[PDB]
């Protein structure tokens, strides 16, 4: 999920070598570095997806490569594209035991294909979610993002009269503090790269209980208008 370039440069020869299962492993890994990455974020992203489509097509490929490309497409476009793999924890320093166990398990699918589903353990959502805190209810409120809107967006869908008479006679990349902040609703995809640029509004019915630290966690706000009602996004548990 770090999207480190040097790893991609090193992996580029691996995904093109004659040996098929190495190609499978390289394709699976390359989809683990660029998870939740758009073409705008990095130019190489689109060509990798084109290579995935080519290997899925072009039936003259080994079955190992086909499986690798299919699983790489599954990982790269993770669940709703709204979830990332974070072996490292949040602002603190932790291994996040669940993710490490899941990824060790996912590395074990060389002797049991069913174990490949264990990678769903390490899937962590990317959200800056706000709650009232007085009753643990999700409110609706916009937030400022000081970056270009053209970067942290979902990638596009899969696509496949004599003078007139004489007139014809002669005819023969940083995105760093781009200003102009644009509103982002609560409960929306916040990439870890863009999470640092996320800011609240100084004036609002809700103000954060602390100073936002640019992570992908939960932030409790403070109701400055404890009498008026505002629209609440209802959680799945709430309607029963």
């Amino acid at each position: 999920g770090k999207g480190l370039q040097s790893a991609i440069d090193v992996l580029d020869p691996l995904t093109k070598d004659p040996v098929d299962f190495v190609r499978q492993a390289a394709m699976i890994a390359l989809s683990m570095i660029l998870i939740q990455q758009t073409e705008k974020l990095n130019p190489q992203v689109a060509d990798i997806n084109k290579n995935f489509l080519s290997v899925i097509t072009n039936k003259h490929q080994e079955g190992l490569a086909k499986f690798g490309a299919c699983v790489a497409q599954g990982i790269m476009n993770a669940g709703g594209r709204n979830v990332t793999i974070q072996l490292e924890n949040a602002d603190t320093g932790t291994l996040d035991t669940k993710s490490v166990v899941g990824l060790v398990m996912f590395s074990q699918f060389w002797y049991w294909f069913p174990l490949a589903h264990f990678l769903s353990l390490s899937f962590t959502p990317t959200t800056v979610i706000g709650i009232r805190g007085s009753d643990q209810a999700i409110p609706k409120f916009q937030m400022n993002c000081y970056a270009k809107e053209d970067a942290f967006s979902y990638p596009r869908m899969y696509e496949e009269t004599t003078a007139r008479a004489k007139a014809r006679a002669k005819k023969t990349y940083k995105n760093k503090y781009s200003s102009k902040p644009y509103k982002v609703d609560n409960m929306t995809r916040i990439l870890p790269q863009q999470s640092r640029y996320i800011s609240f509004i100084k004036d609002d019915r809700f103000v954060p209980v602390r100073k936002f630290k640019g992570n992908n966690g939960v932030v409790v706000l403070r109701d400055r208008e404890p009498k008026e009602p505002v629209a609440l996004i209802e959680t799945v548990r709430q309607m029963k």
């Binding site: 602002d91 979610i129 409960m187 209980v209």
Partner: protein
């Protein structure tokens, strides 16, 4: 380098007293980075983490992110119990909810279960109990997944 924790304590108590909240947070975070990334002797690491925890606790205004980092790294139930004791004494509902959510987002399972059990035994506010149980956080994440789904079904076909 010299494994002199008492000298660190003396220097910190001499300097941080005549300083503001932000400056003390900066210097303590630098010390925390040095302890996390450089110290090899794990017992010395635990000692310096504990002393940093004590210094932040005694400090008048405490940035609870640093205390969260310390309790996560040291993985001590009693230290988090003291943290929640202070937090309940201050009666900061927003701080309580935020610290509980941050602890849920990053903590060993054993420590989380032990802390939840001890808080229930001490009968804290049930909001903290249900939050630290982990159900609301996973529920909210499930809601985020369900509402903002964007799947390329054509690619799968």
């Amino acid at each position: 380098e010299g494994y002199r924790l008492d000298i660190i304590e003396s220097a910190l108590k001499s300097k941080l007293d005549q300083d503001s909240t932000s400056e003390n947070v900066k210097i303590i975070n630098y010390l925390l980075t040095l302890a996390i990334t450089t110290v090899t002797n794990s017992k010395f690491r635990s000692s310096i983490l504990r002393k940093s925890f004590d210094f932040l606790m005694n400090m008048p205004n405490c940035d609870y992110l640093t205390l969260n980092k310390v309790v996560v790294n040291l993985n001590d139930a009693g230290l988090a119990l003291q943290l929640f004791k202070k937090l309940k004494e201050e009666n900061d509902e927003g701080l309580s909810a935020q610290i509980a959510f941050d602890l849920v987002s990053s903590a060993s399972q054993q420590l989380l279960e032990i802390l939840v059990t001890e808080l229930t035994a001490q009968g804290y506010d049930p909001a903290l109990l249900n939050i630290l149980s982990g159900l609301p956080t996973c529920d909210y994440y499930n809601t985020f997944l369900l509402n903002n789904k964007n799947i390329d079904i054509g690619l799968l076909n």
